[PDB]
């Protein structure tokens with residue numbers, strides 16, 4: 001018994017991420033925090049367990065005028081914010097061509113708008129077989145289908161044959177092919193596309209476009225950019241989108257959730273890049289329209305907060321340095337998990353950065369339910385176990401790769 | 414020249430509201446707030462021209478924990494917020510039957526969701542001929558068509574015949590009929606559908622669905638709920654949604670924006686109301702999914718701030734007492750304009766409540782342009798001039814109608 005539209009009739013979300021986090025904090029309220037390890041949600045908590053609100057960000061944010069907290073922001077977002085995000089995102093790497101940006105609600109809004117405006121209903125959207133689960137829903141809630149290519153070959157190199165084969169397949173059947181790359185610090189694996197592999201990607205994508213029947217739209221979910229590596233090394237690939245043929249458009253979906261540790265402020269920028277000023281202006285206008293059509297403006301105090309900080313050299317250096325403490329702090333946790341994981345013999349995907357590390361298993365769900373017994377609370381995907389290294393203090397990181405590998409060995413995994 | 418999908422290309426907002434509003438702000442920043450009449454945006458300013466952020470709301474919002482400021486909130490919203498939003502919306506009038514709520518990005522989010530889930534591609538959506546322009550963009554960006562019925566008969570009463578006529582034409586071409594009512598305190602007019610009229614509206618919808626051909630989805634945008642009249646009076650109509658036939662689903666789009674004075678912060682709930690428990694559950698699930706597919710989740714601090722207040726009796730009465738002082742201010746402002754508009758002979762649509770008053774004319778663009786040179790900023794609609802009384806102190810409101818009449822006379826527009 002349903003009154004919903006034809007395409008909406010059967011929708012129900014199974015959300016593993018959020019309940020699984022719930023029994024976590026549920027075991028950590030009543031029985032004490034330190035007998036529970038929380039590997040669920042992508043939020044940074046410090047060595048003592050508290051959620052990190054970077055104190056430079058919070059200080060700006062709390063000091064704002066009534067107008068910045070409750071006033072309206074323009075539809076496209078605050079122009080200072082739009083310039084500050086591109087500044088932060090690009091670093092010394094800002095590509096040439098025409099760049100135009102629109103404020104979005106997180107990376108989610110970015111991905112939603114990109115898919116709404118650049119694909120037709122029924123179209124397939126491409127990403128790596130290791131990917132953030134929501135992409136599924138962003139496509140499927142709209143009549144699009146998310147399809148995948150094997151990210152890794154046998155030795156864990158970017159798998160170019162798998163990618164090119166899948167792209168050629170979408171290209172044969174639809175004019176626009178949208179491909180989402182989530183890099184650097186891929187969610188779940190932590191993997192980052194290398195500079196040489198971007199070269200091979202773009203060179204292939206330029207060859208495809210020269211045939212003359214397709215446009216390619218390259219989405220890049222950069223959410224983990226500030227958690228992936230040295231400042232210039234992780235951004236250097238941004239130079240590689242300069243002066244691409246106009247049949248290729250690039251959309252960098254940048255977010256403040258991680259970089260500024262504002263999660264529930266819901267704020268991002270989608271940043272379009274084109275050799276062609278008209279194509280780039282169309283990116284701004286069509287995505288501006290979808291914003292008005294959806295949330296109509298994004299959160300003001302969070303936009304104003306990150307613009308203020310980035311424009312004040314003292315304040316911005318103070319913020320880079322507080323964030324880098326927390327990221328050095330994460331990088332080490334993954335060092336401790338990487339070293340013990342290797343000695344004990346536990347398989348784990350090739351992490352270069354990011355909040356998560358994943359253990360490949362076909363059994364993840366089962367292996368997770370017995371982990372929930374140990375007071376170890378983690379996320380189960382179709383491909384394996386995802387663990388939030390952002391959330392796990394040094395205390396429980398060491399000897400953790402043992403407690404997981406020990407659960408799998410008992411069950412035949 | 415164009416890479417966007419076929420249905421996307423050409424989209425361009427010509428956005429009047431924020432461009433005018435920007436001009437006003439810059440005028441006032443340079444020349445002082447007290448030297449500009451800023452009738453642009455639906456935000457409250459007090460008798461000094463200061464943006465109002467209610468003391469009880471601000472103190473709670475700034476006093477939140479880090480966890481409540483930056484923590485992710487669940488896809489459907491904070492359960493406490495969903496519960497508090499239904500409670501302050503429905504009052505003593507909560508309808509009977511199955512109720513399920515979902516967090517949205519303001520009222521835009523709720524209506525974006527409603528249209529995405531309850532209409533097929535190409536369908537028509539009905540609203541009054543005086544409406545908030547955003548509805549049109551919501552429809553057209555997703556490939557629907559917003560269509561209108563004349564809100565007023567010749568006496569400036571709810572035009573039941575123009576409306577029923579419109580419903581019939583839609584019901585003849587598609588299964589679902591979505592109708593958006595912006596009441597009480599309509600944007601742009603300030604009109605509120607009266608209770609008897611809701612009876613006649615509802616009676617007609619029941620007859621319509623008794624045929625077996627259609628579902629009706631009634632969207633009610635309640636943004637102005639708290640600015641419209643006495644607490645119980647403005648809410649009384651909610652009881653009329655008790656046990657409607659299951660072919661009628663009522664969606665109440667609530668916002669924090671105006672009620673709590675977080676204007677820029679688009680935070681609301683869409684509250685579904687159905688007699689049939691599976692209808693309501695379905696409302697919950699298609700809308701949660703679309704929340705994940707669009708914004709993933711809603712601003713956490715705004716939600717908690719509101720749940721906290723509504724759940725505290727002492728903080729709740731104090732918040733209301735604060736909001737009420739400002740509601741009175743907006744009343745007086747509208748009374749002044751009306752008195753004076755009637756004296757100078759300047760026509761005006763009927764204003765019950767809300768932040769805006771509208772002057773009908775097909776000349777708004779030329780008129781507004783002239784008013785600017787006088788440091789008066791109002792918004793030009795296609796059919797009229799929208800004035801936000803919420804943003805215009807009394808001493809400024811005095812003489813305003815005369816000035817608008819005089820601009821229309823000088824420009825040869827009567």
Ligand SMILES: O=C(O)CCC(=O)C(=O)O
Pocket residue numbers: 070071072073074075431432434435454456676677
């Ligand atoms: O008055 C306000 O609330 C702000 C409006 C604004 O900044 C804009 O023009 O986008």
Ligand SMILES: O=C([O-])CC(=O)C(=O)O
Pocket residue numbers: 017040041042043132134187
């Ligand atoms: O929000 C989610 O789906 C899970 C998460 O931790 C993130 O990647 O932000």
Ligand SMILES: O=C([O-])CC(=O)C(=O)O
Pocket residue numbers: 430453454455456545547600
């Ligand atoms: O936001 C707009 O388009 C105009 C406005 O003042 C409101 O009704 O919220």
Ligand SMILES: [Cl-]
Pocket residue numbers: 007121142143
């Ligand atoms: Cl569809």
